[PDB]
């Protein structure tokens, strides 16, 4: 039925959620999975949160992404309040009321990366490569592991995702086009698209490729 993870909470805040889950016999875990239904994010009073990996995966999975206030207010009324009333509205990066979480819940039949082939080309920091891959897969993309492995065809849309900061003395992210024919974009193309649950144009994310 229901299964929660939390994100952005202090070990303590996790303990109030833990008390809540225990009382109501709600599944609470530390790791997010396909079975997770709810991601409880720490927010400000207007339901705006920080962009964490769990936030991204929650939206990517079309889950309920709700404020910690759902828990505290529910306790305060000894009732079990409704998620809807506490859905996160935005985040500190992409907009205070972008309604990304609601859009993802409502767009599972038309995923933002449907019809795209994406290679997450390392290295990356703070986000394990296979989690970025899971994120895009949840979002409808086909994951490609090597540059030489993109499917060919006029109907295929390959995209290489990299995080330039992760490299150093390796202006090698400009030399990817020499190995394949696909636009090369920063990981922010993925992150912004997911948070907003709207596939962004590649333009502002594109990385120049040396001929």
């Amino acid at each position: 039925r229901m299964s929660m993870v939390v994100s952005g909470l202090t070990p303590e805040e996790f303990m109030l959620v833990y008390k809540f889950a225990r009382k109501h016999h709600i599944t609470l875990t530390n790791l997010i999975t396909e079975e997770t239904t709810h991601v409880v994010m720490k927010t400000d009073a207007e339901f705006v949160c920080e962009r964490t990996l769990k936030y991204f995966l929650g939206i990517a999975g079309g889950k309920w992404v709700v404020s910690y206030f759902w828990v505290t207010q529910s306790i305060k009324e000894r009732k079990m309040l409704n998620e809807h009333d506490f859905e996160v509205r935005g985040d500190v990066v992409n907009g205070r009321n972008h309604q990304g979480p609601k859009r993802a819940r409502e767009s599972q039949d038309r995923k933002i990366f449907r019809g795209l082939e994406i290679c997450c080309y390392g290295p990356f920091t703070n986000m394990p490569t296979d989690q970025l891959e899971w994120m895009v897969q949840l979002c409808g993309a086909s994951v490609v592991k090597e540059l030489s492995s993109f499917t060919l065809g006029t109907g295929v849309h390959p995209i290489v995702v990299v995080q330039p900061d992760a490299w150093t003395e390796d202006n090698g992210f400009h030399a990817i086009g020499q190995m394949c024919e696909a636009p090369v974009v920063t990981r922010e193309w993925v992150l912004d698209s997911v948070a907003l649950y709207q596939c962004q144009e590649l333009d502002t994310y594109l990385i120049p490729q040396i001929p």
């Binding site: 952005g8 909470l9 070990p11 720490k42 962009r51 990996l53 986000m127």
Partner: peptide, 8 residues
Amino acid sequence: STSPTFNK
């Protein structure tokens, strides 16, 4: 929390 955040 110990969880990384992703800002610009």
